[PDB]
Amino acid sequence: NNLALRAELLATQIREPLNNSIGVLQSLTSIGKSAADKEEQERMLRSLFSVVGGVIISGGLWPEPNLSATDPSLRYDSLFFNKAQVDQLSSWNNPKAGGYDRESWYLAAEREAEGLYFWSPVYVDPYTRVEMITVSTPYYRNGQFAGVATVDLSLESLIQFVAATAEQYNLGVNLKDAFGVEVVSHNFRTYDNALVSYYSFGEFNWQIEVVNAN
Ligand SMILES: [Cl-]
């Protein structure tokens, strides 16, 4: 019944939103590493999030904060965009609210080597209210860590894509993330010695188990 082949076909599709997110992150880091000023970066980021598709829903640039600045509005200067049209949000730069430099997705990438990517736990962004997984990476300027870039994946969009693809291939699938959270479970069950095909994504530390659908 070609289960292993169809499971590989499904894994290739599941890899697409994740490879897509990595590519967008590479574009974000190019912008963060550049000599463009704040307004030029805002324009490029707005354009970038306007053209990207798939499961990508928000993200942007998170400069290393200056917590010692006397003006509270100068401490945090993230460039964060949300795909509704594309809106720029300032909500994460609220000094009263702790800023962003202690968030899991910032800390994972902080001062890490360029070219490494980090995947957050599932969470609901407190300002866009979208349930999401974030991929992040550091960027540098003049040899020094300068900030974190992020891309947010819509969990709802990811679920729909994986389930619809598995249905098309007449498969059931469970997809778990690196924290053991069940991202998607679509028509998956085992009985009467049903074969299960397992695949581990080596770059993302995610896991799928696949069965034939009846
Ligand atoms: Cl689900």
Residue numbers in the entry: 44 to 127, 131 to 260
Text taken from the publication that reported this structure:
The canonical V. cholerae quorum sensing circuit is controlled by four histidine kinases CqsR, CqsS, LuxPQ, and VpsS. CqsR, however, is regulated by ethanolamine, which is produced by V. cholerae and the host. As anticipated based on sequence analysis, our structural studies confirmed that CqsRp is a double Cache domain, which is the most common extracellular ligand-binding domain in bacterial receptors, including, among others, histidine kinases, methyl-accepting chemotaxis proteins, phosphatases, cyclases, and phosphodiesterases. In V. cholerae, ethanolamine binding to the periplasmic domain of the receptor CqsR controls quorum sensing and infection site selectivity in the host.
To understand the mechanistic basis of ethanolamine recognition by CqsR, we determined the 1.55 Å resolution X-ray crystal structure of the CqsR periplasmic domain (CqsRp) in complex with ethanolamine. To obtain this structure, CqsRp crystals were soaked in cryoprotectant containing ethanolamine. Electron density corresponding to ethanolamine revealed that it binds to the core of the membrane distal domain. The ethanolamine binding site consists of a hydrophilic platform and a hydrophobic lid. More specifically, the acidic side chain of CqsR-D198 plays a critical role, serving to coordinate both the ethanolamine amine and hydroxyl. As both ethanolamine functional groups are chelated by Asp198, this enforces a higher energy gauche configuration for the ligand. CqsR residues Tyr169, Asp171, and Thr196 mediate additional contacts with ethanolamine. The aromatic hydrophobic side chains of residues Trp105, Phe123, Trp138, and Trp151 form a lid above ethanolamine, with the face of Trp151 prominently positioned to engage in hydrophobic contacts with the ethanolamine alkane carbon atoms. The dissociation constants (Kd) for CqsRp binding to ethanolamine, L-alaninol, and serinol are 1.3 ± 0.1 μM, 3.2 ± 0.1 μM, and 15.9 ± 0.8 μM, respectively. When ethanolamine binds to the membrane-distal Cache domain, it triggers a reorientation of residues in the binding site.
